[PDB]
Symmetry: C3
């Protein structure tokens, strides 16, 4: 039962690293998408004034 638990300890450690980095990726994708949304809104507003 000792090895079983340390295989879990490792798995959880690996998952933790994967979830932390995915959080950074999600934050970045969120920021990118919001910036694209605002730029597309600007383009369309400039088009309305024409």
């Amino acid at each position: 039962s000792n090895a079983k638990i340390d295989q879990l300890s490792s798995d959880v450690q690996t998952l933790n690293a994967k979830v932390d980095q995915l959080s950074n990726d999600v934050n970045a994708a969120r920021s990118d998408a919001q910036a694209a949304k605002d730029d597309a809104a600007r383009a369309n507003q400039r088009l309305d004034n024409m």
Copy 2:
């Protein structure tokens, strides 16, 4: 070995909460990006008709 397992139980519980909320963040980033893509496509189509 009892404490080792309850440290794992906790870790897994925490990770679960982190992955659920990241799923909501990913869904939101996906939706945002698709909306930006469509708005940018609209801008460029309006430009083509000019």
Copy 3:
């Protein structure tokens, strides 16, 4: 203590599947957002030349 550990094994397995698929979702949201950003930049550049 045997059942406790196999409940964990399962939980970790499930989480793994959730994190892998979220990685695919994040990669997709990242790509989508970058594409929207570039299209919005194109729209705004075409507007500048007008």
